[PDB]
């Protein structure tokens, strides 16, 4: 039978089936380590990061001018900033092409990958928003060479675009 019939049969992030956790405030479902932060198995009720971002947004409607990028980057990683960074990281994973940047590469003076950023963010290693944003941009900085197969070049271009669009939407940057 379906134990959670009003929640998705498929992970919001990776669009695959399996062992899923089911949000109590929206129909979304997630693998334990696809959600960011990791799902707390014993939290009841549990609201996913989409619902928690929506709550923050509804209680602090944005200004018409928005924010400067440098103002945002200099922010201490207070709980709202941490959550927005987690949601921004998650929106990158939400693209299937993210898997090519998720794992440790097998060149650059500072390799970087999404699972390393996930770990650093979960351990709250970043003390400012800029620490997170800098590591995310390093991933794309490290891939600035034409690939023999153009599709691999276009891949980083598109994931970088996904990051930058979400970064400005989520933090409401000018």
């Amino acid at each position: 039978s379906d134990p959670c019939p009003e929640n998705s049969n498929i992970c919001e992030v990776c669009n695959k089936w399996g062992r899923l956790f089911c949000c109590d405030t929206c129909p979304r479902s997630f693998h334990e380590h696809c959600h960011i932060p990791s799902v707390e198995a014993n939290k009841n009720p549990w609201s996913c990061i989409f619902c928690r971002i929506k709550t923050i947004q509804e209680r602090c409607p944005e200004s018409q001018s928005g924010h400067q990028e440098s103002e945002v980057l200099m922010r201490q990683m207070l709980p709202e900033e941490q959550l927005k960074c987690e949601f921004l990281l998650l929106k990158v994973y939400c693209d299937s092409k993210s898997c090519f940047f998720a794992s440790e590469p097998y060149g650059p003076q500072k390799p970087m990958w999404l699972n390393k950023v996930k770990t650093s963010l979960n351990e709250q290693t970043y003390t400012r928003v800029e620490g997170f944003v800098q590591d995310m941009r390093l991933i794309f900085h490290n891939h600035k060479e034409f690939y023999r197969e153009d599709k691999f070049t276009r891949l980083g271009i598109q994931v970088q675009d996904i990051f930058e669009k979400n970064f400005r939407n989520i933090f409401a940057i000018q």
Binding site: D2, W17, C22, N44
Partner: peptide, 8 residues
């Protein structure tokens, strides 16, 4: 958190 097992 509620959970379920799904399958393709």
């Amino acid at each position: 958190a509620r959970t379920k097992q799904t399958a393709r």
